[PDB]
Design a protein around this ligand. Structure first.
Ligand SMILES: Nc1ncnc2c1ncn2[C@@H]1O[C@H](COP(=O)(O)O)[C@H]2OC3(O[C@H]21)C([N+](=O)[O-])=CC([N+](=O)[O-])C=C3[N+](=O)[O-]
Ligand SMILES: [Mg+2]
Ligand SMILES: [Mg+2]
Ligand code: NA
Length: 997
């Protein structure tokens, strides 16, 4: 018994005992190390996978490979029992088949392993984490879930993942709800308690005092103690049940297997059609005149073709593509959770992004602020100000009219600054490490803390105070004046919050306790009946309200697009008891009969790149919808400002608020979505509905989200996008995660999606095309009787290079060139277009011709070379027998190692040229010089060394039936290959200047 048995049936002390730790200290470095060695890291077994060798063996089991590797033994164990003994070639022949076949598996394992690596390494970008308490310090630590030792103290809050099996110690919140969907199969969140369950053998649905490793905190916060980790996890003892869940294949991978297998069919027919037509040649003297031998040799030709020219692993290539793709993506702060996601991402047609934080920086600060100044019936003067310093740091002055003043010398600004600090839940904190201050709570509010500290409306000291105390200086001071009794926080219905305070130097304070109100101006204003003019209060007249509002609009609608709130108090607050501090609806009741003090106005600029990334979207034909927390006015403004909306365009109907939407009928809602770009003050549901309608127009939609309650809409979206600083519960629902929470990154991701598509297309063209040619060649020698240009072994070598090195080097092609200037790709369109197929044949076929051509040339038009048998090079089987056409031509010439070291000498170089045509799908080599993909270029040279080496190191060429050639002859190779560069080039030009899309 290594595990703590039935903690579900124990008390909190019985659990704090078994390991021995306090919920203040946590596990000491000692016990940390001790449990780390006795129980081990909280993670599954480092499963091995397989060995190279064994995998190679597995690959050696094909119908064709078993057949061929045997059909070569027959022709060898026969070439020994004949009459005419020169056995060396037939001896080494089936062995080379073996060596080559092995080298197939070599690259096989090589590339798959490469694909496997780009999978695992994705997880390095987003490790598992959790909050713990250990003896080190009394603060909250975060660590990788593998670093959690069964025994330490775990902290869980709204949006986190239970990193281990914990027994609940303290329900920090009030109602603890847990998303156990992954294990218990119960999506609906369950409530949790600290009472001990009786039955130790109780089912999960009963152990409602336990939190399971992989379940998600849905509502509230909690503390607990770890009982088991590693494999003994309630989930870990089930993960042995299913190890293989890659159940599903993208419609693209599908469409590809469909086509590629369908090609396998044609490749097979025009294979046993090659062997079949050569039946009258089963009795030739060279075959010892044996039907059996005849069928053996040509059977080798057909099968050898089958084995090479057949597509070795199409589904693998897609994989190679995504692997490599996701690697670049993740490197760009685009963490792609699912694989199919990426394929889809290319087709992204719509992007729903949130303004706050994603489209803007969220560097919250207060730009301007105003208060009433003089009121005389219709005369109403304002006090406009400006506060310098966009930072969260209190390093700025409060200008008035471009001249700095002293906030304190205005009573309006006094009450103002107080409201701020006393309506503030967050505050600041100087950080020593980074050497800067940082928010502590909601940034909206913090910017307020900053303002107060900048205002210093009590002239308190600063320079003599440390940069640590400095941060909460004036704030503390304001707390010294007022005691925060209770708070009535926000509610999207009334749009505000209030606090309640009593004076400092006062014990019997009846008419000394006040109420501080901060909320959106819209509303806060309408519930104001008085206006504070310095330390006075005059009745809140129409005209005043009228002006107040005019400014608020100027600011919000201005080239500053300012989020501004209105601050006010209640001098006549209901009895410290008359308030029932429970019901939200009642809270607005108490927040009436107010005095309007002032209006702050605040900024959170849009990320620099954004403008550009949006303009780009327009180019790539993608649509962009901003969802924001601002009113329609400000939202439209922001939209105009960042290029979502034009400077002058009529947006009347292209932007909605939650309300407006809801006040629409559904048939018209669906209608809106088709042209909407800006949504404001919407509810979490609205997202999902928006997505819905966007689907209804066959849009591929990216949806940003980061809230627990976002999860449904994200999940409904084609591409869910969760923020890196978002709920993990949100991320579990999303297809991709934004490391840098940036809208610009989204856009880059989409671009990458498109580029990957291209690379997939590149690896394909060159594959399929090369192989097309690989067949036509061997079919021509069969359709013309020509002494075959390549023999089985020669062909399997070339193949074993073409799809071995220069092929994989295409996995290193850079992105294309007009990739973003075209409209988004449709998931509906076919993988290989009609024109593309033709392109494949054109090149492919061409390669066969220049393969038999290379032979044809060394004979008929054989310059300075033997043969020169102009006509009837066709029949060569009529030579030993019917030789009245023989003239200075020995028969053993159609068996010369020259036409071979021509065909093959050309093919290998033609494949190099083809590899270069496959840099860009449509873009010329003039626009995309071949010196662009260094790696590919490298493969060429490597391959070239092997070709030379199989011609110049005697063991090789002899065994391969190949004699090297002179320069006067290499010229023919080039003069015969390079025309492909040009042919494809021509074709690309038509695809380019005629069928752009
Ligand atoms: N559905 C909605 N309907 C109306 N207003 C909303 C809505 N959603 C958010 N808001 C308000 O829009 C703002 C968010 O940007 P975003 O990132 O959300 O797009 C939010 O700021 C405050 O109320 C919020 C707020 N608060 O806790 O959330 C507290 C406030 N306070 O009293 O201190 C004031 C808010 N305010 O808007 O004035
Ligand atoms: Mg092949
Ligand atoms: Mg938000
Ligand atoms: Na989803």
């Amino acid at each position: 018994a290594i595990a703590m048995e039935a903690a579900h049936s124990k008390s909190t002390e019985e659990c704090l005992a078994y390991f021995g730790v306090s919920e203040t200290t946590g596990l000491t470095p000692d016990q940390v190390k001790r449990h780390l060695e006795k129980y081990g890291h909280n993670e599954l077994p480092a499963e091995e996978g397989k060995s190279l060798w064994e995998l190679v063996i597995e690959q050696f089991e094909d119908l064709l490979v078993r057949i061929l590797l045997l059909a070569a033994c027959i022709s060898f164990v026969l070439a020994w029992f004949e009459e005419g003994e020169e056995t060396i070639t037939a001896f080494v022949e089936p062995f080379v088949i073996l060596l080559i076949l092995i080298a197939n598996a070599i690259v096989g394992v090589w590339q798959e392993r490469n694909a496997e690596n780009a999978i695992e390494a994705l997880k390095e970008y987003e490790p598992e984490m959790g909050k713990v308490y250990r003896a080190d310090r009394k603060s909250v630590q975060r660590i990788k879930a593998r670093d959690i030792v069964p025994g330490d103290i775990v902290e869980v809050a709204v949006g986190d993942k239970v990193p281990a099996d914990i027994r609940i110690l303290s329900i920090k919140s009030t109602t603890l709800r847990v998303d156990q969907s992954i294990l218990t199969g119960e999506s609906v969140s369950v409530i949790k308690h600290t009472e001990p369950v009786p039955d130790p053998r109780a089912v999960n649905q009963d152990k409602k005092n336990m939190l399971f490793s992989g379940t998600n905190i849905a509502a509230g916060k909690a503390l607990g103690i770890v009982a088991t980790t590693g494999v003994s996890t309630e989930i870990g003892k089930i993960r042995d049940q299913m190890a293989a869940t890659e159940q599903d294949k993208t419609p693209l991978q599908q469409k590809l297997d469909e086509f590629g297998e369908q090609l396998s069919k044609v490749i097979s027919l025009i294979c046993v059609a090659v062997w079949l037509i050569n039946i009258g040649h089963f009795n030739d003297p060279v075959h010892g005149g044996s039907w059996i031998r005849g069928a053996i040799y040509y059977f080798k030709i057909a099968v050898a073709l089958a084995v090479a020219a057949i597509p070795e692993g199409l589904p693998a290539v897609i994989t190679t593509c995504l692997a490599l793709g996701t690697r670049r993506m993740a490197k760009k702060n685009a963490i792609v959770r699912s694989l199919p996601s990426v394929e889809t991402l290319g087709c992204t047609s719509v992007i729903c992004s949130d303004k706050t934080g994603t489209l803007t920086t969220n560097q919250m600060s207060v730009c301007k602020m105003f208060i009433i100044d003089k009121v005389d019936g219709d005369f109403c003067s304002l006090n406009e100000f400006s506060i310098t310093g966009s930072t969260y740091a209190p390093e700025g002055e409060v200008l008035k009219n471009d001249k700095p003043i002293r906030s304190g010398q205005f009573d309006g600004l006094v009450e103002l600054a107080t409201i701020c600090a006393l309506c503030n839940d967050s505050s600041l904190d100087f950080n020593e490490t980074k050497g800067v201050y940082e928010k502590v709570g909601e940034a909206t509010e913090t910017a307020l803390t900053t303002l107060v500290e900048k205002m210093n409306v009590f002239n308190t000291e600063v320079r003599n105070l440390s940069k640590v105390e400095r941060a909460n200086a004036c704030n503390s001071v304001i707390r010294q004046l007022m005691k925060k009794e209770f708070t009535l926080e926000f509610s999207r219905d009334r749009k505000s919050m209030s606090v309640y305070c009593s004076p400092a130097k006062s014990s019997r304070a009846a008419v000394g306790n006040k109420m501080f109100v901060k909320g959106a101006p819209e509303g806060v204003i309408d519930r104001c009946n008085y206006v504070r003019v310095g330390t006075t209060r005059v009745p809140m007249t129409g005209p005043v309200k009228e002006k107040i509002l005019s400014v608020i609009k100027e600011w919000g609608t201005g080239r500053d697009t300012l989020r501004c709130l209105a601050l006010a108090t209640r001098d006549t607050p209901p009895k410290r008891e008359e308030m029932v501090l429970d019901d939200s609806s009642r809270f607005m009741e108490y927040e009436t009969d107010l005095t309007f003090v002032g209006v702050v106005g605040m900024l959170d600029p849009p990320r620099k790149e954004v403008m550009g990334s949006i303009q780009l979207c327009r180019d790539a034909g993608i649509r962009v919808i901003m969802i924001t927390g601002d009113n329609k006015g400000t939202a439209i403004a922001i939209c105009r400002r960042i290029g979502i909306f034009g400077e002058n365009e009529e947006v009347a109907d292209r932007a909605y608020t939650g309300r407006e939407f809801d006040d629409l009928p559904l048939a018209e809602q669906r209608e809106a979505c088709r042209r909407a770009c800006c949504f404001a003050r919407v509810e979490p549901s609205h997202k999902s509905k928006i997505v819905e309608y966007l689907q209804s127009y066959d849009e591929i939609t990216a949806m940003t989200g980061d809230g627990v309650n976002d999860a449904p809409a994200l999940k409904k979206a084609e591409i869910g996008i969760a923020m890196g600083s978002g709920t993990a519960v949100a991320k579990t629902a999303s297809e991709m995660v934004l490391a840098d929470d940036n809208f610009s990154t989204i856009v880059a991701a989409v671009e990458e999606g498109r580029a990957i598509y291209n690379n997939m297309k590149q690896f394909i063209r060159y594959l399929i095309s090369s192989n097309v040619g690989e067949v036509v060649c061997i079919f021509l020698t069969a359709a013309l009787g020509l002494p075959e240009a390549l023999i089985p072994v020669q062909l399997l070598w070339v193949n074993l290079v073409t799809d071995g090195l220069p092929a994989t080097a295409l996995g290193f092609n850079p992105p294309d060139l007009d990739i973003m200037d075209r409209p988004p790709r449709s998931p509906k369109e076919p993988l290989i277009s009609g024109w593309l197929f033709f392109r494949y044949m054109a090149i492919g076929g061409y390669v066969g011709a220049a393969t038999v051509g290379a032979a044809a040339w060394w004979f008929m038009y054989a310059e300075d070379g033997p043969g020169v048998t102009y006509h009837q090079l066709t029949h060569f089987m009529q030579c030993t027998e019917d030789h009245p056409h023989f003239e200075g031509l020995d028969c053993e010439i159609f068996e010369a190692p020259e036409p071979m070291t021509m065909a093959l000498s050309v093919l290998v170089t033609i494949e190099m040229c083809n590899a270069l045509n496959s840099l860009s799908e449509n873009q010329s080599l003039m626009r995309m010089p071949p010196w662009v993909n260094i790696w590919l270029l490298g493969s060429i040279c490597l391959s070239m060394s092997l070709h030379f080496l199989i011609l110049y190191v005697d063991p090789l060429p002899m065994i391969f039936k190949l004699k090297a050639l002179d320069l006067t002859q290499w010229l023919m190779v080039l003069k015969i290959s390079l025309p492909v560069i040009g042919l494809d080039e021509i074709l690309k030009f038509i695809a380019r200047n005629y069928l752009e899309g």
